[PDB]
Design a protein around this ligand. Structure first.
Ligand SMILES: *[C@@H]1O[C@H](CO)[C@@H](O[C@@H]2O[C@H](CO)[C@@H](O)[C@H](O)[C@H]2NC(C)=O)[C@H](O)[C@H]1NC(C)=O
Ligand SMILES: *[C@@H]1O[C@H](CO)[C@@H](O)[C@H](O)[C@H]1NC(C)=O
Ligand SMILES: N[C@@H](CCC(=O)O)C(=O)O
Lengths: 79, 183, 93, 238, 150, 147, 43
């Protein structure tokens, strides 16, 4: 949990650095926190090629992390 | 070994899905000008598989409005099969054998690839050299017996002995202090 | 349920002083090597009409999960019965 | 919107207005969560209780009658100078020659060739192969189906013709059968380790062989979409 | 020939009003070979002690036709009276013992062969001759399974 | 000799004989080629599944025997009108009975007289269980097209 | 303590391969963002 939270903060800092090339840190961390707990919360997406690729790679992280959690939990309830 | 990316799907499937996403993307572009911008096709085709909200592109033509509905339905099947397959690894394991006890086929018919013995001059020896149904097991056991109960347990740890028959009051104490043996 | 015990086969009973007792045993062994008794087995003994199983993965049918279909319909009918109340809510309040 | 909401809402959509629209979509959204959660769970149950299938169906398969009509030909053979060779020779000639051009020398050599990929199938006696399948390093070797003979016969004692001990031997064998000694002998000598209940091997590939249905469905869908496109174009042109 | 009512081996169906057996085909359009059986009536030979012609076909009926063509002999199949397989009992508390059913009808001279699923054991092998086995099987237990509830 | 029915081993090098619960069997050896070697046998020990049945038969009906091993061919084959192996030995009368994994068939039942069978057998095919399974429509195994 | 099923909780190094993917993409992206910045200047 903390091992992914530190990388979340790193990605937020990278997005802040890319923003140089109204996107503050609050919306960034909100979007990056919602994207991994099933994106449900209304959020605003950034602009340009850099923002789009950073969010797409983070979105692939979320799909794999969420699918292995439900599978592991199912194994514990069955055994 | 938890090969996160390589365990659920094979190496050939990850490349076929990654190539089919471009086939549907450029198709939506051709279905627009024949009845979206070069950039709309790229995100909208990737914005449904990765489960991320990027851009506002949407197929306007009725001919492309049905390709997108089947495209969305194809991503849910992959994710549903991804989780279901990953759940088969942590619940199903390889069938172990482990000797069932004294009536095991490996002990009734001994060979030169399985070695089992006990301690010499104890009441385990008297139990085997007295019954006549245990005649074939005693001859194979007599040529491998050790001197004490502290040297036979170490042999099982160094892979020089296969099985060791002793009292349950002592063998259940080493199995609890040494986490690499089992009864 | 269970395994097999007292494994003995079927035969043709004939009296001891029978001249045919030698020609019958030479015809049964000959019908086992040319495939004559497997046509008789797949015709009368082996059409297995109802398959058995232990785990039996069962696919859910319409009536299996029909309780979830009822929820959408119920909500929609109550909603209009409630939409009219909502329409009257904007007129009175 | 109503089609996207049940296949994981991913597609950009616009929501309606007012109290009526909001309540209708919220009740439909609850339908989607329950429908999607029971699908993944049911699919997981099928993969955990799946069951394998045999490669061939017997000696009357296409691979044994026409080996050249496939991939690099199927390799099967047996050891000569026996009863199975005499049985195969009288019923199949081309198959007899094809399996005789792949002769062996023993049971252990045949098992080694089958384990080292040098052979695909081995035809021999039933009891010997059952014993070899029930006693192996691991449970890699198996018999087709679940254990089945094709030429039913048994083991007997060969005595001289027109003797006086045949009746006594038959009566003694039947008495041993009626007392229960055969079960003890088979439990002592004919016991096995492998051949347990055929559970799942927990496959770890899910390659194109299993996942071709979704690609076929996508191809059919895109073909139908192109057909509807050209039909609408021809209708608008007229 | 003497047979017994066994569903996987011998079917016993009544004749029509004409007197012959009605035709019947299999799933691949080939005719089924039947024969004119003659045994007891429907219920039992006890009160209605009379015989009526019937029809026979099954696993043990088409096997006798193959033996009749190879060995070139004629047969006349009928059903056993009491409906038993055969066992040795005591008769009126006497010093002698006798068989019954299909086993006691062959030794009495009322039959020549027994085409039926008769189990080869040690008790019957001391009086008659059985041939090589035509079907390998054994004994098992038949019970009723439960229904699962989801 | 077979794998589960007739096991052949060596005698005890300490006493020069076979162990208990076994049967002493004697195979002959021919080493010389230019000259004919006098009859010289070795002493082996035979046991297995058929040996116990033979012991029980010999205990039921009183008779004595002396086992030995075949050296001419294997189970029996008819070459140019002459039977080899155990089938040929019983036919030219040097053996009286043959015990082992001999299967009753029509070609051999015209020169010998088999007994009631004590175990069932036949023809089978052995293949290696591959890592693959069967699941072409696993995605359609869930809810049918009605829902 | 012994067991047969032994439900094992995944640790950090157990699924560390997925953490590497985000970092790798981010470093290549700047090495690619500079190329993207130069792409707007030259093209
Ligand atoms: C099957 O029997 C034949 C006999 O016809 C065996 O063939 C001979 O093999 C021996 C052993 O090397 C040679 O000494 C002979 O010269 C061979 N004769 C012929 C005519 O080829 C054959 O080896 C046997 N095969 C098996 C597997 O037992
Ligand atoms: C076969 O017949 C006899 C022995 O049975 C012999 O004289 C003849 O030479 C044999 N021929 C061959 C080819 O074996
Ligand atoms: N039992 C066979 C040999 C083994 C086999 O052919 O499978 C025989 O006596 O000829």
């Amino acid at each position: 949990w903390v091992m992914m939270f530190v990388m979340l903060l790193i990605v937020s800092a990278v997005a802040v650095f890319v923003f140089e090339y109204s996107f503050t840190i609050g919306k960034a961390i909100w979007l990056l926190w919602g994207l991994v707990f099933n994106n449900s919360v209304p959020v605003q997406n950034p602009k340009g090629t850099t923002s789009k690729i950073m969010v797409s790679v983070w979105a692939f992280f979320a799909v794999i992390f969420l699918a292995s959690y439900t599978a592991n939990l199912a194994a514990f309830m069955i055994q | 070994t938890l090969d996160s990316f390589m365990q659920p799907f094979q190496s050939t499937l990850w490349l076929l899905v990654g190539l089919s996403v471009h086939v549907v993307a450029v198709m939506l572009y051709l279905l627009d000008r024949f009845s979206l911008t070069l950039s709309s096709a790229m995100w909208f085709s990737w914005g449904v598989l990765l489960n991320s909200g990027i851009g506002e592109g949407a197929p306007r033509s009725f001919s492309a409005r049905i390709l997108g509905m089947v495209w969305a339905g194809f991503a849910m099947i992959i994710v549903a099969s991804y989780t279901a397959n990953l759940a088969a690894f942590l619940v199903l394991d390889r069938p172990e054998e482990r000797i069932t006890g004294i009536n095991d086929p490996r002990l009734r018919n001994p060979s030169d690839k399985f070695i089992y013995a006990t301690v010499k001059q104890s009441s385990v020896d008297i139990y085997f050299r007295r019954q006549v149904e245990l005649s074939t097991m005693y001859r194979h056991m007599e040529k491998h017996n050790y001197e004490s109960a502290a040297e036979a347990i170490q042999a099982v740890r160094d892979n020089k002995l296969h099985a060791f028959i002793w009292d349950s009051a002592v063998l259940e104490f080493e199995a609890s202090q040494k986490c690499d043996l089992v009864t | 349920t269970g395994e097999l015990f007292f494994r003995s086969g079927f035969g043709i009973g004939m009296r001891k002083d029978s001249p045919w007792k030698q020609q019958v045993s030479l015809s049964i062994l000959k019908s086992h090597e040319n495939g004559f008794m497997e046509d008789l087995d797949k015709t009368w003994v082996r059409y297995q009409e109802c398959d058995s199983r232990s785990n039996a993965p069962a696919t859910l049918t319409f009536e299996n999960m029909a309780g979830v279909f009822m929820l959408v319909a119920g909500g929609i009918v109550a909603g209009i019965f409630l939409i009219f109340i909502e329409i009257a809510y904007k007129r009175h309040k | 919107l109503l089609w996207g909401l049940v296949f994981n809402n991913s597609v950009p959509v616009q929501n309606p207005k007012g109290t009526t629209s909001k309540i209708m979509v919220s009740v439909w959204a609850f339908f989607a969560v329950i429908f999607l959660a029971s699908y993944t769970a049911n699919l997981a149950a099928f993969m955990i209780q799946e069951e394998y299938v045999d490669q061939v169906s017997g000696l009357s398969d296409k691979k044994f009658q026409r080996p050249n009509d496939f991939s690099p030909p199927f390799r099967f053979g047996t050891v000569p100078n026996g009863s199975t060779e005499r049985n195969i020779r009288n019923n199949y000639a081309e198959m007899h020659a094809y399996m005789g051009k792949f002769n062996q020398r023993g049971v252990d050599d045949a098992l080694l060739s089958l384990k080292t990929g040098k052979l695909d199938a081995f035809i021999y006696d039933a009891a010997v192969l059952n014993y070899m399948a029930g006693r192996d390093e691991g449970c890699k070797l198996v018999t087709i189906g679940s254990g089945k003979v094709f030429a039913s016969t048994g083991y007997g004692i060969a005595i001289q013709k027109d003797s006086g001990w045949k009746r006594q031997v038959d009566l003694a064998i039947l008495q041993l059968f009626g007392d229960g000694e055969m079960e003890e002998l088979e439990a002592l000598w004919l016991t096995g380790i492998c051949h347990n209940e055929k559970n799942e091997v927990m496959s770890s590939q899910l390659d194109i062989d299993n996942m071709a249905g979704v690609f076929y469905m996508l191809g059919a869908a895109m073909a139908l979409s192109l057909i509807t496109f050209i039909c609408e174009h021809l209708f608008y042109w007229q | 020939i003497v047979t017994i009512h066994q569903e996987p081996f011998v079917y016993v169906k009544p004749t029509m009003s004409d007197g012959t057996c009605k035709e019947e085909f299999t799933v691949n359009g080939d005719p089924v070979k039947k024969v004119i059986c003659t045994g007891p009536n429907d219920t039992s030979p006890g009160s209605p002690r009379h015989t009526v012609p019937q029809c026979c076909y099954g696993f043990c009926i088409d096997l006798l036709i193959k033996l009749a063509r190879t060995m070139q002999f004629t047969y006349e199949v009928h059903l056993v009276a009491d409906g038993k397989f055969g066992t040795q009992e005591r008769v009126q508390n006497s010093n002698k013992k006798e068989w019954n059913g299909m086993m006691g009808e062959l030794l009495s001279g009322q039959a020549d062969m027994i085409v039926a699923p008769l189990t080869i054991n040690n008790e019957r092998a001391q009086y008659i001759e059985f041939s090589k086995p035509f079907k390998y099987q054994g004994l098992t237990i038949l019970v009723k399974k439960e229904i699962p509830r989801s | 000799e077979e794998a589960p029915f007739v096991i052949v081993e060596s005698v005890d090098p300490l006493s020069g004989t076979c162990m208990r619960n076994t049967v002493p069997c004697q195979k002959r050896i021919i080493s010389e080629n230019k000259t004919d070697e006098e009859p010289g046998y070795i002493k082996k020990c035979c046991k297995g599944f058929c040996i116990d049945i033979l012991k029980k038969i010999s205990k039921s009906v009183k008779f004595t025997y002396d086992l030995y091993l075949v050296t001419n061919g294997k189970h029996g084959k008819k070459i140019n009108g002459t039977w080899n192996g155990m089938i040929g030995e019983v036919v030219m009368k040097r053996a009286y009975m043959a015990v082992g994994s001999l299967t009753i068939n029509e070609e051999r039942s015209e020169v010998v007289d088999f007994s009631v069978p004590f175990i069932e057998t036949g023809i089978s095919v052995m293949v290696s269980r591959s890592n693959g399974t069967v699941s072409p429509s696993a995605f359609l195994e869930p809810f049918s097209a009605d829902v």
